[PDB]
Structure formats: structure tokens, C-alpha cells
Design a protein around this ligand. Structure first.
Ligand SMILES: Nc1nc2c(c(=O)[nH]1)N[C@H]1C(S)=C(S)[C@@H](COP(=O)(O)OP(=O)(O)OC[C@H]3O[C@@H](n4cnc5c(=O)[nH]c(N)nc54)[C@H](O)[C@@H]3O)O[C@H]1N2
Ligand SMILES: Nc1nc2c(c(=O)[nH]1)N[C@H]1C(S)=C(S)[C@@H](COP(=O)(O)OP(=O)(O)OC[C@H]3O[C@@H](n4cnc5c(=O)[nH]c(N)nc54)[C@H](O)[C@@H]3O)O[C@H]1N2
Ligand code: SF4
Ligand code: SF4
Ligand code: SF4
Ligand SMILES: [Ca+2]
Ligand SMILES: [Ca+2]
Ligand SMILES: [Mo+4]
Lengths: 274, 875
């Protein structure tokens, strides 16, 4: 009873939208009997989230491609009244005919991945191109996003729960909204880029960028991170949870220290003149 | 009615596998190699690892959604005729674009047959010719074309037009501007329009790179050109090798957003201030290759004195550069010291040359500044060179296959690179012959594409150079006038496509020229009803390359870019199968031209009795392909992956020049007569000239041009924030690079899927608006919020856009992509605000310099505000 899983590496998304152009190519002008009626222009089965952090000039941005989670404990399957079903391989599919005329289906999603197709009068969403996965003729044996990528963001695999769990731990994979307990089969790598924050700055000694200064990040009073400044005098502590932190800097025997508040925002301390 | 079949075809965004069923395209995808029949890939061992590319091709966004363009509803349906146009009565020139002026373009036209459309066009051609002559017929396609060698403009268009007219609106060297009008005089490379050689740089970089400086370069977006995302893994390799990536770009571009270690946001038109401060530092610290410079530079002593401020009283310090660009002094100095002591490659532009910075008002000094830096560090030596990481792949340079730029079936040696090698292979002087043009030549008559409006509405113009002046360093210096002596003024205009409103400069003027009474007739041969098409009198439906047969190679342009397939991880040659019948009543450009040939009584001479496919086989046999497989076998397979050539000795770009020896690469130049015993660059001295001898002669002959001195110096950009009186009213600095999700106009508009991409267009009340990125501080100061409709404007026009507040721009700078495909005026055409998104309505039309006749688009001063809904019909 081997299942499907998908791994996305946020650090690698460049937002070229090859994925998205991938569904549209597969679903906008085509109909797949048994899986889904044609897609409605404007929907984002594949939704790429965008998030900018920090402020000029030490800012950054990361993206998060978001298809259907196809979670193991799918709420809309549990509340779809038979309009949504889970296959043995783990793919969650909406019955194109049984789901017709039911707007309420959308609200059963904690992720908001299904969309209402006006003309077809039915909820639609990510099918993980099950219609392609079920066909031998489709040599790639993977969804359109993954196959359209030119940035090596996706890793599509069909294996056992033991194999996937092992992988989750070796690579530190994570899911969106773990606290809901739906257990998505779509994992994210480097998700901290998208969900956490950082603190950065640039150290100057006598007017020039100072390389090799030792910097330490503290919370509560204990070291949480350490680093040395590059040739631009900068350091950057990412994957930070909200809270208060203390940055201690040591360069040429000269010490500097300051507090920083992380509240769903990354901070740029600017130039620290030592 | 049948089964699905996998076919092959390509595009400007990469080769693709096309699945068809019952005459309908079901999907298009990247290509997977079948290792049972496709040759093994190259391998590179460097710094302890083994690097080999993926057994697969990649595609660009606009190609991934190309199906939506092919089946577009804005796709021209059938031949059309402007209702208000009467060949034998009131021509009503003043009503061209009337529909567009009342926001209903389509209602200006009615449907007519092909037989009539061509009958009308032919009657105009013959009338004009016998009364004014072939020169009275103006015509011009544009820079880019649907993929396909045999049907590319250099091939089909030229072959037919050369036999009918005509006055060509030769193209300005848009992509190369700065390198072409300025850099060329400094180091030659005219056969590449000023761009540098790039051969075998990948292995050299992997083995030696420690740092790479991306200046006006965004490889992920541009891919160099035509290369999808082929180079993405190469930068991954460099990244994992510990190589630092630094970006200098007003906008934190997409490559930077993905892998930048540091980003600098210089104010528009100020880059050369940074390069001068970097050179200054090297000179003050003796941190450059003095030995290299003593042997390969010319006029360096004097240039050095200027950089030190001896001759002008202003040392080019990092602080001086900060005050000019906004970039911190300490960071400029830090980069300079790191650059000097590390094996640094200068990625100027995304191809190895090019770069939006070159087609700006400071484009000439930027290109020369780039050459300066690279020179001082000794380009050509191991671990030191100009490389953008997109070219340099170890492909078989020995294997020969033509690029579209080599003319295809035209054989036009004057306007294609056919004269180098392909012409000799394609034609035998016995059964198949070329199609020369005795008008589209220097002693004939042509006009600058950038000044078409002034020629039509003004009836006169004088300029320097003819299109791509790549013959020699000084060809661009030659003087031309319009009308050319003995030739006639333009009476007719045959357009191929209609993108100038979104692609040229201060474009409202292109909308205005169409109603000038001097224009007796306007034909438009296009694929989609958009841009300039709604100004024509007759519209002919052309089809995409997916509705005709052709042949090409992955990203192979060639010509002014010799062996550019080195942009790809593999050399993929593919048969572009006719996957479906032409959509609607459209037909291929070649069949359109064949119908005219029959009407003009020249069918035999033009077609030689061949259909597109017959020309393909003849084309095939003129390449090296037969060495591997016959036409039949190739037709059957659909594509061919050129085998690797493991043994050939490597010849790194510019290394022969660095080491003072003879040129050993496959480059198409310099020409023997431009070298002394085939050593040195194409310049007079064979050295990198900081004081250009070509320009020194030009200026001593009387051609005084303050914005293009013989010596590379800090000439303040005439369209920058601190040196233009214009900044008082328009304080915001704007740059408008190439579109991320479209190949210029081919991808945007047309009701394509790309219009649903979040970072491409924004829907607001039913209409998808073009985007302009604004820095939070400038937006707040104007009461502008994310998603708000704003008005960008200056003395040239107004453009309605949706605002995107971001941090990826230094405060004071705004960004908006160019190449909008949609021209949609709120009022009278050319006199009112546009909401389609044609940012180029606002760019400066002044030539880069008095004699440098190129576009300076990326330096534009504007002002923004929330749009009060007015149509602003004041232009
Ligand atoms: N998706 C897509 N890819 C394309 C194209 C397209 O239309 N769409 N065009 C293709 C073609 S024709 C070509 S010629 C190549 C060209 O390759 P490039 O000339 O590199 O293309 P541009 O988009 O102008 O990229 C210039 C980059 O430089 C930055 N820049 C612009 N002006 C300045 C300046 O004054 N200073 C500095 N420091 N940076 C600056 C911009 O932010 C931009 O990211 O791209 C090719 N690739
Ligand atoms: N602000 C700013 N402006 C710029 C630049 C910049 O960096 N900044 N970049 C400049 C550069 S490098 C360039 S290259 C130009 C882009 O220069 P282009 O000439 O302006 O623009 P394209 O969008 O490629 O337009 C090609 C036209 O050919 C038509 N066409 C394509 N294939 C076929 C075919 O098979 N048959 C027919 N009948 N028609 C066909 C298309 O529909 C389209 O209208 O933009 C330039 N302008
Ligand atoms: S195709 Fe790959 S890089 Fe492109 S937006 Fe999707 S995940 Fe991102
Ligand atoms: S992501 Fe939503 S649609 Fe998919 S299975 Fe989970 S709850 Fe249902
Ligand atoms: S698997 Fe198919 S339906 Fe699911 S996001 Fe990917 S492309 Fe879309
Ligand atoms: Ca990122
Ligand atoms: Ca160095
Ligand atoms: Mo170009």
C-alpha cells in the first residue's frame, strides 16, 4: 500500500511560476472524466505564496508553492458526505459529479485550497494529476509542477510511511499548520525561510567593514546562535521565533551589545560603528 | 476519434514535447532524454567533484503556458479591413486607430477573404512602385520572432521582401547599445556588437571561481536568452563550492532574491560611479594586475590620472561614489578589496555582456567601466575573466548547425550572418539561389527603427550607422540621411507584428504617426490583435510555429552571437512538427508570401517549387546533421542530442589575449586584417583602449560629442536624478527591464495564462493591470498602498499601474517591466493615459549621445500618485 508524497524546498523557489502554468496547461482546456472538469481561469490549485522580510537594504524574500496538502486525516473527506474521497495511495479527490451544487465543501478545508468553478457549479482543487499518475504512458510519473520545475524544488516520491518518516527526520521536513493534526503528505524543506524571522546588521571598525568579528545571539541569557562577520561586516541569524533577543558583538577587543524584538518581522540593526 | 501522440516543437523558451489528440494540443512539457538513443552528457571534474548536467531540458514560464497563446481569442481570426478605408476613394488616414480611441478596436474592422486582402495589397504595391519606386514601401518586423529557423524573419521575411521592395526600418542594436556604441571602440568585438567571447568558461569557473560579481545581471530571468532555466544548477554548484555571489542592480532581481550574498541598489544611471571608485581603490592600493595592464592596455596612464582626480580636481573616491549612487562607501571599498584579492568573475549583464545598464543614458560609460575593471584584474587568466555563468558550457563547438541569424532560405549576406558559412552550404549556384536586396544596403535606403515616427511625420532625418554596425569598429560612425539621395519618401508601411508601443521609447509618437496623411497605406501581418495592429488598413492572419513545419536548435541564434547554444546544458536539435492545422483562417508567413509571389508573378523564383517542409530537408542537408542521421530518420525521431566531444583542447575566452598569443577560439573574429599576425584585439593597437583611437579620430574629424568622449570618463547620465533639471518635477528614478513572465510581448496580454501570475499583472475591478514596484518609504509619502492603482507620468505621457510596495528598491527608485503587449488608451490614441501598461510611453527618446544612435530607456525620470480616475488626454 505504497503512498504518494511531495517534498518542496522553499530555499529553492524563485517564483517563475512554471508549476502554475503547468496545471493550467493540464487543466484549463482539458477535461479529465473521473477526476475533474476543466479548471476555471483565476483559480490557484497550485498557489505560490510570497513573503518579503526585513527592510531595505538588508531585506529578503522567499516563496512557498502550495498545492493541495492531501493530508492523511483529511477534514473535508470526513465532512464531505461522500463528495470527497481518499484513495489507498493517499490522494484526496473530489468527486466531480457528487460535489456539484455544493458551495459548502470549500469551508471544510483548513488550508483553503479548493476553489469554486462558476460554470461547472462545483468545488475544484489539486488532484496531484492522479489522471497522469494512473497512466503508464506518462513516462515522468510525477505531477506537472514537479516536472515543470527548472529549479529542483520538488522531490516527488511513492514509498512507505516508514521511509517517509525516516526522511522527515533526516532532513528536518515540516508541514503547514501541524497543530491541526491533518498530517499533510506534502512536506517543506527550509520552511523557516518562509515562517520565521532573522536579525541582521553590519559592523564597521574605523570606517570600514570589519570581517571576522564574533557575534552571539542570546535569549533569556543563553547563547542561541553564533557567527563571524563576512567581508561586508554582516551577520544574519535566521529561523528565529518571536521573542526578545540580545546581540553581543566582539571586534578588536571592542564590545557592543543590544536588544532586539522579533514580532513576525525580521530586523536590520543597520551599521554598528565600532 | 484517435489516440494521443507525442510530437516535438520548440520555442523561444525552450524545446518541448507536445501531446496531440484529434487535432488538438493537449499539453506541452520539458524534454526527457532516452539514454538508449541519446548521447551521454559532458562531465567536469573540478575542486574534487564531478559535475554533469541533468538528462533533461528546461522551459521558461511563457513557454509553459504557450498553449493559451496559440488558442487565444485575441488571435487574429481572418483577413481584416478597416471599414473607413477605401482604396479607390476616401482613405481616411486620420481614422487609423479611431476604434482604439473610443475603446473599441475590433469595431474598426470588417472581415474579408484572403483573395481580396491580397488583391488590395498587391494593387497598392504595384501602384506605389511604378509611381514612386520600391523605396516608397517601408517595412519592418521586429527584434524577436516565433521559434523556427526556416521561417524566422532573417529567412522567410527577407527572402520575400527582398524580391518585392523595399525600405527597411533597420533595428537599433537594442540588446547591445552600450557595448555596441561605446565598448566596441574600447576592445573591438564588433562581430558580437561589443559583447565578449565566452568559450569554455564553465570548467574554468568551477575550478577557479571564489567570487562572482553580477552587475546588471539576472540570469534566472533572462537565461542569457532562449535558454529556459538551463544554468540554474551551475550556480547551485558554484554556491556549494563556497563561491560568494554579489549583486549590483537598482532592483533586487530574481537571481539575487534566490542566491545573493550581498545586494547593492545604485540609483539609476550611476553604476559607472561605482566602477570608478573601485578602480580608484585598486590604484591607491596597487591591488591590480599591473603586468597585465602594461602589456594589454593603451592610454592607461592618462586614464589613471583622471580616476585619481589630477586632471579634473575630483578623486573618484568611494565617498564621492556614495553621494552619487546612494550605495555606502565602506561597502564599495570592501567589494573592491575582495575583488582584487579573490579570483573574481565579472558577470556584467546576463549573457556575458548586455545588461539593462547598457541601454540607459549611462550605458556607454557602464560598458567601458565594466571592461576597465575586468582589464585591471587581467581577464583571460585562470580565475579572472568576464563571465555571467550562463555561457561557457563544454559543448561540441566543432559540430556545425545554423542559428536563425544565419539567414535560413534568404541567403541575404548583407542582413543576416549567412555570409560567414551557411550561404556557402545552402546554395549551389545551380539549382537553388539566394534573395539579395539592392535597397537594404548602405548605399541604398533604410531608416532607424527608433526614429520611424520622425521620418513619417517629419519627412526627413539624419543619423549615424545602419542597424547592427558589426562589420568593423567604425561602421557605426558612417552618416546616413532620409530620404536617401535619389530615393523616395515612405508612402506605404508593411508591418510584421506591432509591439513598438511597449518596446521602443517615448512611444506615444508611434501611435501618432499612423494618422499622418503622408501614409497612404498600412498592412499588418501579425498573429494577435494587439499593440499596433489596430492601426492598420489591412490585417493578415499569421500562425504560430506550432501550426507549421520547421527546424531549429535549442537557443541557437548565432550570427552576432557565435555559438550561443553554449547557454544550454546540451545541444538539442529538433524538428518543429506541425502539431495542428493553422488556427482560424490564419496561415504561415511563408504561405502568405507564396500567395503574394503568385500574384506578383514571382512564385517560381521565390518558392523554387518548395513548401516549407521541402525547404527544411534542404536546410537539414546543409548542416553537419547528415553525419549522424538522414533526414528521414531525423524526421521520425523528432529531436537529436548532439554527442559530447571529450577530447577537443579547451580554449578559454580571452586567454589567448591575456597571454599575448594568437587567437585560438572558434570565435568569428577579429578578421585577419584587423590583427597583426593574428594577435591582439580588433582595435588599432590590438590593446584595450581607455582612450579609444576610433573615437579620437572621429572627434578630430569634427564630430564633437560630449556624451561619448574618446576617454572613458564619468559623464553624468543626462536622465538621472541629480543631473537632470527634469528631476524637479519627476523625482523618481525608473528602470524598465525585460518581463519576467513573457518573452517581451509574446506572453503578456492575449488572454494568456501568464496574466494570472501574481507578480505579472494584478486584477482590480475586472481588469488586469501592469505592475510598478515602489519602495515602502516612497509609497507611504504618497499615500500609496499595495494594490492601489497609481499613475506614472512625466512630459511624455501617463500610464496606469497597480502598485507593489516592496523593499527590493532603494528609496527613490521605482521599477516596472517593459514589453507590455497591451496598448489600451483611456482617451484619444497617443494623446491620453494608457492602462494597458506600456511603461515605454515614459522612457526618453533622446539618443544615448549625439552620434550614439541607441535607446537609453533604463534611465527614466517619473513621478507617481494615486490615480484619480481621469484619462489625462493632454499629450
Ligand atoms: N523572461 C524573459 N527573459 C528574457 C527576455 C524577455 O523579454 N523575458 N529578453 C531576452 C533578450 S532580447 C535579451 S537581449 C536578454 C538580455 O539580458 P539583460 O540585458 O541582462 O536583460 P534585462 O532584463 O535588461 O536585465 C538587466 C538586469 O539589470 C538590471 N538593471 C537595469 N538597468 C540597470 C542599471 O542601470 N544598473 C544596474 N546595476 N542594473 C540595471 C535590471 O534590474 C535587470 O534585472 O534577456 C533575454 N531573456
Ligand atoms: N524600457 C526598456 N525598453 C526596452 C528594453 C529595456 O531593457 N528597457 N529592451 C529593448 C530590447 S533588447 C529589445 S530586444 C526590444 C524588444 O523588441 P521587439 O521588437 O519589440 O518586441 P517583441 O515583443 O519580440 O515583438 C516581436 C513582434 O513580432 C511578432 N511576431 C513574432 N513571431 C511572428 C511570426 O511568426 N509571424 C508574424 N507575422 N509576427 C510574428 C509578435 O507578435 C510581436 O509583435 O525592447 C527594447 N526596449
Ligand atoms: S516551478 Fe519551481 S522555482 Fe518555479 S515557482 Fe514553482 S517551485 Fe518555484
Ligand atoms: S489540503 Fe484541504 S483539500 Fe486537501 S485533503 Fe487536506 S483538507 Fe482536504
Ligand atoms: S499535482 Fe497537478 S493538480 Fe496538483 S498542484 Fe501539481 S500540477 Fe497542480
Ligand atoms: Ca529566496
Ligand atoms: Ca582578483
Ligand atoms: Mo534584446
Amino acid at each position: 500500500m505504497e503512498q504518494y508524497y511531495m517534498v518542496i524546498d522553499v530555499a529553492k523557489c524563485q517564483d517563475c511560476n512554471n508549476c502554475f502554468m503547468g496545471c493550467m496547461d493540464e487543466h484549463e482546456l482539458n477535461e479529465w472524466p473521473g477526476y475533474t472538469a476543466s479548471m476555471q481561469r483565476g483559480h490557484r490549485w497550485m498557489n505560490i505564496e510570497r513573503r518579503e522580510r526585513g527592510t531595505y537594504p538588508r531585506n529578503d524574500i522567499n516563496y512557498r508553492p502550495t498545492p493541495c496538502m492531501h493530508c492523511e486525516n483529511a477534514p473535508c473527506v470526513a465532512k464531505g458526505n461522500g463528495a470527497v474521497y481518499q484513495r489507498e495511495d493517499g490522494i484526496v479527490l473530489i468527486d466531480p459529479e457528487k460535489a456539484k451544487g455544493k458551495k459548502e465543501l470549500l469551508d471544510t478545508c483548513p488550508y483553503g485550497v479548493m476553489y469554486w468553478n462558476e460554470e461547472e457549479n462545483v468545488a475544484q482543487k489539486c488532484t496531484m494529476c492522479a489522471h497522469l499518475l494512473d497512466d503508464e504512458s506518462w513516462a515522468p510519473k510525477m505531477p506537472r509542477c514537479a516536472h515543470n520545475c527548472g529549479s529542483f524544488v520538488y522531490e516527488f516520491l511513492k514509498t512507505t510511511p516508514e521511509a517517509m518518516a525516516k526522511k522527515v527526520e533526516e532532513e528536518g521536513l515540516e508541514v503547514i499548520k501541524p497543530e491541526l493534526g491533518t498530517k499533510p503528505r506534502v512536506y517543506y524543506k527550509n520552511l523557516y525561510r518562509f515562517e520565521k524571522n532573522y536579525v541582521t546588521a553590519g559592523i564597521l571598525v574605523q570606517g570600514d567593514c570589519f570581517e571576522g568579528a564574533k557575534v552571539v545571539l542570546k535569549s533569556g541569557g543563553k547563547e542561541v546562535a553564533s557567527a563571524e562577520t563576512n567581508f561586508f561586516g554582516e551577520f544574519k541569524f535566521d529561523a528565529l521565533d518571536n521573542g526578545e533577543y540580545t546581540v553581543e558583538i566582539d571586534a578588536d577587543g571592542k564590545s557592543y551589545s543590544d536588544t532586539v524584538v522579533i514580532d513576525d518581522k525580521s530586523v536590520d540593526l543597520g551599521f554598528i560603528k565600532l | 476519434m484517435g489516440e494521443v501522440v507525442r510530437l516535438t516543437n520548440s520555442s523561444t523558451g525552450g524545446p518541448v514535447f507536445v501531446y496531440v489528440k484529434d487535432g488538438k494540443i493537449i499539453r506541452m512539457t520539458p524534454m526527457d532524454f532516452d539514454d538508449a538513443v541519446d548521447a551521454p552528457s559532458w562531465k567536469i571534474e573540478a575542486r574534487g567533484k564531478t559535475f554533469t548536467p541533468p538528462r533533461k531540458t528546461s522551459i521558461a514560464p511563457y513557454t509553459a503556458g504557450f498553449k493559451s497563446m496559440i488558442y487565444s481569442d485575441l488571435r487574429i481570426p481572418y483577413p481584416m479591413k478597416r471599414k473607413s478605408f477605401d482604396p479607390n476613394g476616401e482613405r481616411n488616414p486620420q481614422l487609423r486607430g479611431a476604434g482604439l480611441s473610443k475603446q473599441d478596436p475590433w469595431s474598426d474592422y470588417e472581415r474579408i477573404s484572403w483573395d481580396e486582402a491580397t488583391d488590395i495589397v498587391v494593387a497598392e504595391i504595384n501602384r506605389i512602385k511604378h509611381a514612386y519606386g520600391p523605396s516608397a514601401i517601408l517595412s519592418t518586423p521586429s527584434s524577436h520572432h516565433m521559434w523556427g529557423n526556416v521561417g524566422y524573419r532573417h529567412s522567410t521575411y527577407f527572402r520575400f521582401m527582398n524580391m518585392m521592395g523595399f525600405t527597411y526600418a533597420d533595428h537599433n542594436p537594442d540588446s547591445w547599445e552600450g557595448w555596441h556604441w561605446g565598448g566596441m571602440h574600447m576592445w573591438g568585438f564588433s562581430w558580437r556588437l561589443g559583447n565578449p567571447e565566452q568559450y569554455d568558461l564553465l570548467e574554468d569557473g568551477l575550478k577557479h571561481a571564489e567570487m562572482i560579481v553580477f552587475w546588471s545581471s539576472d540570469p534566472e530571468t533572462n537565461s542569457g536568452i532562449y535558454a529556459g532555466f538551463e544554468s540554474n544548477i551551475r550556480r547551485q554548484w558554484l554556491k556549494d563550492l563556497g563561491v560568494d555571489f554579489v549583486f549590483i542592480d537598482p532592483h533586487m532581481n530574481h537571481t539575487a532574491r534566490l542566491v545573493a550574498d550581498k545586494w547593492f541598489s545604485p540609483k539609476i544611471g550611476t553604476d559607472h560611479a561605482l566602477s570608478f571608485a573601485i578602480a580608484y581603490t585598486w590604484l591607491k592600493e596597487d591591488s591590480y594586475d599591473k603586468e597585465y595592464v602594461a602589456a594589454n592596455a593603451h592610454g592607461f596612464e592618462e586614464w589613471a590620472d583622471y580616476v585619481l582626480g589630477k586632471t579634473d580636481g575630483t578623486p573618484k573616491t568611494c565617498e564621492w561614489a556614495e553621494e552619487e549612487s546612494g550605495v555606502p562607501a565602506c561597502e564599495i571599498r570592501a567589494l573592491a578589496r575582495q575583488w582584487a584579492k579573490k579570483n573574481t568573475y565579472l558577470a556584467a549583464g546576463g549573457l556575458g555582456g548586455w545588461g539593462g545598464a547598457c541601454r540607459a543614458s549611462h550605458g556607454i560609460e557602464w560598458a567601458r567601466g565594466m571592461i576597465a575593471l575586468a582589464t585591471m584584474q587581467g581577464m583571460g587568466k585562470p580565475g579572472s575573466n568576464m563571465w555571467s555563468t550562463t555561457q561557457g558550457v563544454p559543448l561540441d563547438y566543432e559540430f556545425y548547425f545554423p542559428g536563425y541569424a544565419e539567414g535560413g532560405i534568404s541567403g541575404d549576406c548583407e542582413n543576416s550572418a549567412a555570409g560567414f558559412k551557411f550561404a556557402w552550404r545552402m546554395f549551389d549556384g545551380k539549382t537553388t539561389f539566394p534573395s539579395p536586396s539592392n535597397l537594404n544596403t548602405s548605399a541604398g535606403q533604410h531608416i532607424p527603427r527608433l526614429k520611424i515616427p520622425e521620418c513619417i511625420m517629419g519627412g526627413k532625418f539624419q543619423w549615424s550607422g545602419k542597424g547592427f554596425a558589426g562589420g568593423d569598429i567604425s561602421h557605426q560612425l558612417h552618416q546616413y540621411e532620409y530620404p536617401a539621395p535619389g530615393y523616395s519618401k515612405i508612402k506605404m508601411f508593411w508591418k510584421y507584428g506591432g509591439p513598438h508601443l511597449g518596446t521602443m521609447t517615448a512611444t506615444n509618437r508611434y501611435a501618432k504617426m499612423y494618422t499622418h496623411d503622408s501614409l497612404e497605406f498600412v498592412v499588418s501581418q501579425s498573429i494577435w490583435f494587439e499593440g499596433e495592429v489596430p492601426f492598420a488598413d489591412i490585417i493578415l492572419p499569421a500562425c504560430t510555429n506550432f501550426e507549421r513545419w520547421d527546424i531549429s536548435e535549442f537557443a541557437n541564434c548565432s550570427g552576432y552571437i557565435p555559438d550561443n547554444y553554449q547557454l544550454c546544458n546540451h545541444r538539442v536539435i529538433s524538428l518543429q512538427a506541425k502539431c495542428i492545422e493553422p488556427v482560424g483562417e490564419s496561415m504561415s508567413d511563408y504561405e502568405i508570401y507564396r500567395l503574394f509571389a503568385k500574384k506578383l508573378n514571382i512564385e517560381e523564383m521565390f518558392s523554387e517549387g518548395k513548401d516549407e517542409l521541402a525547404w527544411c530537408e534542404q536546410y537539414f542537408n546543409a548542416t553537419d546533421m547528415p553525419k549522424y542521421m538522414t533526414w528521414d530518420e531525423f524526421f521520425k525521431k523528432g529531436y537529436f542530442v548532439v554527442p559530447d566531444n571529450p577530447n577537443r583542447k579547451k580554449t578559454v575566452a580571452l586567454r589567448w589575449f591575456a597571454e599575448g598569443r594568437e587567437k585560438d577560439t572558434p570565435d568569428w573574429g577579429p578578421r585577419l586584417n584587423n590583427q597583426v599576425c593574428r594577435k591582439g584585439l580588433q582595435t588599432t593597437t590590438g590593446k584595450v583602449e581607455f582612450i579609444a583611437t576610433s573615437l579620437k579620430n572621429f572627434e578630430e574629424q569634427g564630430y564633437i560629442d560630449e556624451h561619448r568622449p574618446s576617454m572613458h570618463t564619468y559623464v553624468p547620465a543626462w536622465e538621472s536624478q541629480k543631473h537632470s533639471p527634469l528631476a524637479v518635477k519627476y523625482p523618481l528614478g525608473m528602470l524598465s527591464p525585460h518581463p519576467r513572465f513573457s518573452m517581451h510581448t509574446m506572453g503578456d496580454g492575449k488572454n494568456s495564462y501568464m496574466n494570472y501570475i501574481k507578480d505579472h499583472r494584478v486584477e482590480v475591478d475586472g481588469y488586469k493591470y501592469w505592475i510598478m514596484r515602489v519602495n515602502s518609504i516612497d509609497a507611504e509619502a504618497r499615500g500609496i498602498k499595495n494594490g492601489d492603482l497609481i499613475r506614472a507620468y512625466n512630459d511624455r505621457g501617463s500610464v496606469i499601474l497597480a502598485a507593489q510596495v516592496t523593499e527590493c528598491l532603494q528609496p527613490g527608485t521605482v521599477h516596472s517591466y517593459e514589453s507590455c503587449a497591451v496598448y489600451d488608451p483611456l482617451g484619444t490614441a497617443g494623446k491620453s493615459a494608457d492602462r494597458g501598461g506600456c511603461i515605454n510611453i515614459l522612457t526618453p527618446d533622446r539618443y544615448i549621445s549625439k552620434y550614439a544612435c541607441g535607446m537609453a530607456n533604463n534611465t527614466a525620470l517619473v513621478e507617481i500618485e494615486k490615480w484619480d480616475g481621469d484619462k489625462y488626454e493632454i499629450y
